[PDB]
């Protein structure tokens, strides 16, 4: 089995504590559209698809948040942003070892759905010229992603 699914929750708890610690309470108007129905579907998916979904989603969060030259407007402590991303990169690398044992797939509707969501988050971030509000919207969405990802990992680990 994928040995890292047992370790995923402790490292997830660390990632969420870093996301909280790096900055303060949200500015006004941080609620944005979130793919709850997609996560309910993945909760019910095969382990293989759960783990592939976790890797796709981790890499998307990393690629959305690792352009630090676009973070001049945030009050976040960038040392803690860098620590956060280092932890997610560890999660992704470790789960990719599990994905390597699967037959590769690129036509799953979950991959298209999560790509579209992350394209929307990036578009709205650029439209708001990387404002503190725009980044806090992404911070709130990412917190929710990571909470639902920990539940997926737990469901995969207990099969």
Residue numbers in the entry: 2 to 160
Publication passage describing the model:
Teleost type I interferons (IFNs) are categorized into group I and II subgroups that bind to distinct receptors to activate antiviral responses. Based on the patterns of cysteines involved in the formation of disulfide bonds, teleost fish type I IFNs can be classified into two subgroups, one containing two cysteine residues (group I) and one containing four cysteine residues (group II), and can be further divided into seven phylogenetic groups, namely, IFNa–f and IFNh. However, despite a high sequence diversity, all type I IFNs share a similar structure consisting of 6 alpha helices (A–F) that are arranged in unique up-up-down-down topology.
The helix F is straight, which is the hallmark of type I ifn. One disulfide bond formed by Cys3-Cys99 is present in the CiIFNa, linking the N terminal region with helix D, and is analogous to the disulfides found in other vertebrates’ type I ifn. The structure of CiIFNa was compared with that of known type I and III members including human ifn-α2, ifn-β, ifn-w, and ifn-λ and zebrafish IFNφ1 and IFNφ2 by superimposition analysis. It is apparent that CiIFNa has the most structure similarity with zebrafish IFNφ1 (fish group I type I) with an root mean square deviation (RMSD) value of 0.879. Notably, no helix element is present in the AB loop of CiIFNa.
